[PDB]
Amino acid sequence: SEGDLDDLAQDLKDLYHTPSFLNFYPLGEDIDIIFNLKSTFTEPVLWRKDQHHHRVEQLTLNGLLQALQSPCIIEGESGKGKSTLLQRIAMLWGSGKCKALTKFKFVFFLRLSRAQGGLFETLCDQLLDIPGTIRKQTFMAMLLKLRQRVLFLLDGYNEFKPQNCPEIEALIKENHRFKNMVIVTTTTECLRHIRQFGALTAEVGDMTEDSAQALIREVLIKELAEGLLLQIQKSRCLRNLMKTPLFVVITCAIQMGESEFHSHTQTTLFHTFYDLLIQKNKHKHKGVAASDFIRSLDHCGDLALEGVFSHKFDFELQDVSSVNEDVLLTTGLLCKYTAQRFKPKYKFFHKSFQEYTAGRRLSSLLTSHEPEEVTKGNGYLQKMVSISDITSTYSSLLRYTCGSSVEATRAVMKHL
Amino acid sequence: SEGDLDDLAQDLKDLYHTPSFLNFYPLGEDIDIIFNLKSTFTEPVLWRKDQHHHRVEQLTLNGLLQALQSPCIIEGESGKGKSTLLQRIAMLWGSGKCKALTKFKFVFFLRLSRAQGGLFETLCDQLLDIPGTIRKQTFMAMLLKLRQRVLFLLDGYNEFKPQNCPEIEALIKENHRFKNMVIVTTTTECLRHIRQFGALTAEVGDMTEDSAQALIREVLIKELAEGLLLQIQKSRCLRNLMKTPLFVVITCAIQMGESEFHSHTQTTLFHTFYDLLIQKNKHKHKGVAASDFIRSLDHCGDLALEGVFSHKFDFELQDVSSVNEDVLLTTGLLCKYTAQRFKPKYKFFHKSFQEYTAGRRLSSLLTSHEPEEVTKGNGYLQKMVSISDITSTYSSLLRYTCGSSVEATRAVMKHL
């Protein structure tokens, strides 16, 4: 019973070249845009983390793969786009081009969030239907005897509920009972459930200038691609924003379908980003009252606005003081960091995002029909009385506030 | 056993030459008109789609068949007449004339909308009754061992309810298990349920001048055929409309049964088409109240009319703002497009159809017994006060309005 093992290895190699594996939805299934893994994010950068949990050594794919350890934990950037890294590893093995992966007899790419019933059942139904020849639980014996010649690539750990498949939870933590190699991807918020068991950790970095331009050029009609690439080259700000995958994909998604180039000022870009963030997690916000959800978002809004005036970007628990923040963290407006820290820290996705949020909130206050809200809005606007702050500290805030409406602009321009 | 496989191949070849397969109803079974696949639409053209969902490289049948990939998705133009393409493939194989198809041992033409109970059961009852000599589920083992020497042609995907036959849904999406070739035909509206899994995609194009004339000549008594061909040659408008199959077959259907040639002004042609759309799908409009169906049609009518005045043919969701629009999408008045775009768009079947729709609505308003509706009708008519618009922009609108009613004509002519 050896011939069928070679067949399994070959079928997996061919499986990882199929469109059903290579095609994915970068903004989620709700938006029907499909990228082909083959010509998209093909040049990732990974930072290694040391005992102090900071970044050391810039590593790249096909570099890290030459120095894999017992279970490796790769942390998503901050919960940005899809961590299309494990898929790239499986693809390279299937192509047989990366020397580092030639030692592996099998590579099993699994979506852990859908695992249930046991490891063998997960493999049988989720990947390749295993021939009855050896479908007698002797497969597991083969893997144990085989040792570290197989990779289990487990995506979506943060979405995994271990009660559904204790066998895999054991594989991730109790690796000494399997004697094989595992790579798991997670998010910052759920890192605490693991990490302890990692032999090597890595963080996904941002995009390079060449990667971002290549992604735009190859996934957008030439005329719009040239328009966008030119605008990025002209702007001294976009080139710094176009490092974050989501802000590279969104700027294309909003242009596809058009027959002409549109500038799409960053204010609209941040607005689009915001709506995607608020709505994509809406499917999990059914657990709270709609009024509680809005109150939480408004609270976050005021937090950002006060933060801008106080030059504060790093928040502690007592600065939020809301048990209902769980929906806010689910939403993803704030990221909760719990590394080598006595007290948890809360941060906004990006400093420019915090400024946007503050702007949106101020704009809303200044246009409210309720005089109490308008007064509060004016209370903040009335601080814009010094040129050294107007053209500096609050430059972003004023731009985002004005770009969010018409009436808000009147209020701001009259003051200025 | 090998002799039984040969008998099946031969029986299928002969099956596809049988009138029960070749004869079809181009306007649906409700209208008792039968076309013979052998002499009708014999020269289709297909457009290959690129990664941007744009049309490139016009292909022909017996061309595309030389470059087939794992499961191929062919999209109907917009939901027109029967997509008699897969049947042509079955014939070409059965006749043994197309070299590209000579490699196939079996070709299975299935009407997916009528599948249930499993793939083997569907094949046994829908096509050729498989002899009891090999009807032991060993047929599937044969197909798996045989590999890509068979074609599954699955028509009517948009009408398929996968819960009835998970085996075929698997065949369409999970083809890594089957290792055979599948061609699926679908519609724009249901494309989003697939595509990701497609290796190659194509769009069905329009008719050539020679094809349309051949279709008229061979399916209409000589005297009427000559009359129609001459009228098309004289006019400067029909020749552009006679590219859409629906407007080639309808113009014949309304003449067959007559003993003389009638001009049948294109206003009546568009009327006939409109009436068919709201009736052929009537069988699926039983899920709404009668008053809601009419309100949706009136809403669509006003949408078209405003669009004519605003030069707007491309609508978004917020321009309709009605959850009940599903009945219009079911009807086929509006087509929903979900390509590589951030937001969905809605379009009318054809710009000339939108103009007709607007005309029909304006005509109705101008003849209503309710003075409020008449006022609205006049509100639009009162804009026809500039010669540069009267003989241009609104030329079609005025013609369709007048040709829809005598009373509407009086209102229009008095104004002009």
Residue numbers in the entry:
A (entry chain A), B (entry chain B): 94 to 509
Manuscript excerpt for this entry:
With the 11-mer particles, the CARD domain density was slightly improved from the refinement without imposing symmetry. Compared to mNLRC4, huNLRC4 has two additional salt bridge pairs (Asp104–Lys272 and Asp222–Arg270), while both the Asp at positions 104 and 222 are Asn residues in mNLRC4. Noteworthily, the Phe435 from the activated protomer is positioned in a well-defined hydrophobic pocket in the receptor protomer. This pocket contains several conserved residues (Ile124, Ile126, Ala346, Met349, Thr365 and Leu369) from both the NBD and WHD subdomains undergoing large conformational changes during activation. Interestingly, this pocket exists only in the activated open huNLRC4 and is partially formed in the closed model.
Here we identify Bacillus thailandensis type III secretion system needle protein (Needle) as a potent trigger of the human NLR family apoptosis inhibitory protein (NAIP)/NLRC4 inflammasome complex formation and determine its structural features by cryogenic electron microscopy. We also provide a detailed understanding of how type III secretion system pathogen components are sensed by human NAIP to form a cascade of NLRC4 protomer through a critical lasso-like motif, a ‘lock–key’ activation model and large structural rearrangement, ultimately forming the full human NLRC4 inflammasome.
